[PDB]
Ligand binder design. Structure first.
Ligand SMILES: [O-][O-]
Ligand SMILES: [Cu+2]
Ligand SMILES: [Cu+2]
Lengths: 73, 273
């Protein structure tokens, strides 16, 4: 089963997630994310650092970006 | 071809390595290595085709990727070889690796920007082009996101694992390859990416020249594992969906197999193994 969708403003940035196998967006720009076999998640800007959920991966991307626009993949 | 511990390079060898890397950047060749690595880490998945990461071919794939990069360096200066970073030994920000005559240091706290060394954005010689984070300067936060690099005792515990890899041949596996990669256990290779931070924590991690020195030491650890376990070898050995078996070719080259890459000494030796 895929995780639930989410939508919130995190550190001033709109993060959205939805099942697709799952998509995340940061201010409307899609962010590559991936699920590991143990159920953890990573994003392309944190791709060696598992976190428990796609929202956690989106928040890790906002933390990584330090305010900068994401560019599309 | 001898791959040397970075800590041992002469000032001349550091100068020549840096100039060769800067020339691959200026000529446009460097950024295509960055692009190839990001394309594989976005496509390598635990339940589908997986080649460069989270799979038994993680190690031969990165061995061939580093060989391609070393050959490109040698096309600029034939005396240059890839050095390796033993992060178990050279484990602080004071390491000579991070000095201004070599890779430069950590980034400043506000925006992660590396401010010294030859790859600092202010030099004009190290544009970050292939990127996901839109910022165009090299960034690092050494020890920011995880507090310690692996220790020698931790590396030893992974080296002692007898099986090369095990079904299901992905990030959930037991065995040496996944413990070295780091998705299970005390975590060697992934933790080093996270410890450097900046681009090294992302799919475009070859944007930092330390990428190559990190993976040259990972590659050395494979060589040490083999010497510890001469009775053990690459697996799987045929018929495995979505996984590169021993005698199967690997993308993107298509013309080389794990079997062709197990013996590093056909291509280089280490200063000490
Ligand atoms: O290997 O990144
Ligand atoms: Cu991915
Ligand atoms: Cu990688």
């Amino acid at each position: 089963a895929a995780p639930e969708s989410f939508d919130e403003v995190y550190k001033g940035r709109r993060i959205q997630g939805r099942p697709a196998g799952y998509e995340v967006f940061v201010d409307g720009v899609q962010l590559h994310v991936m699920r590991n076999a143990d159920g953890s998640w990573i994003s392309v800007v944190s791709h060696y650092d598992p976190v428990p959920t796609p929202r956690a991966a989106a928040r890790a991307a906002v933390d990584e970006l330090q305010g900068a626009p994401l560019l599309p993949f | 071809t001898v791959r040397k511990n970075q800590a041992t390079l002469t000032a001349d060898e550091k100068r020549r390595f840096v100039a060769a890397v800067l020339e691959l950047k200026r000529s446009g060749r460097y950024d295509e290595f960055v692009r190839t690595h990001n394309e594989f880490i976005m496509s390598d998945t635990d339940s589908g085709e997986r080649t460069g990461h989270r799979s038994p071919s993680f190690l031969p794939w990165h061995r061939r990727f580093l060989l391609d990069f070393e050959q490109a360096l040698q096309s600029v200066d034939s005396s240059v070889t890839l050095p390796y970073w033993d992060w178990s030994a050279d484990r602080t920000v004071r390491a000579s690796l991070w000095a201004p005559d070599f890779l430069g240091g950590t980034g400043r706290s506000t925006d992660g920007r590396v401010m010294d060394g030859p790859f600092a954005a202010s030099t004009g010689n190290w544009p970050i082009n292939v990127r996901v984070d839109s910022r165009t300067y090299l960034r690092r936060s050494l020890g920011g996101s995880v507090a310690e690099l692996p220790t020698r005792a931790e590396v030893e515990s992974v080296l002692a694992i007898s099986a090369y890899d095990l079904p299901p041949y992905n990030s959930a596996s037991e065995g040496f390859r996944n413990h070295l990669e780091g998705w299970r256990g005390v975590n060697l290779h992934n933790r080093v990416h996270v410890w450097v931070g900046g681009q090294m924590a992302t799919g475009v991690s070859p944007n930092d020249p330390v990428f190559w020195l990190h993976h040259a030491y990972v590659d050395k650890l494979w060589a040490e594992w083999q010497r510890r376990h001469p009775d053990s070898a690459y697996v799987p050995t045929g018929g495995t969906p979505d996984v590169v078996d021993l005698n199967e070719t690997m993308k993107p080259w298509n013309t080389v197999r794990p079997a062709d890459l197990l013996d590093h000494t056909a291509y280089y030796t280490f200063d000490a193994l």
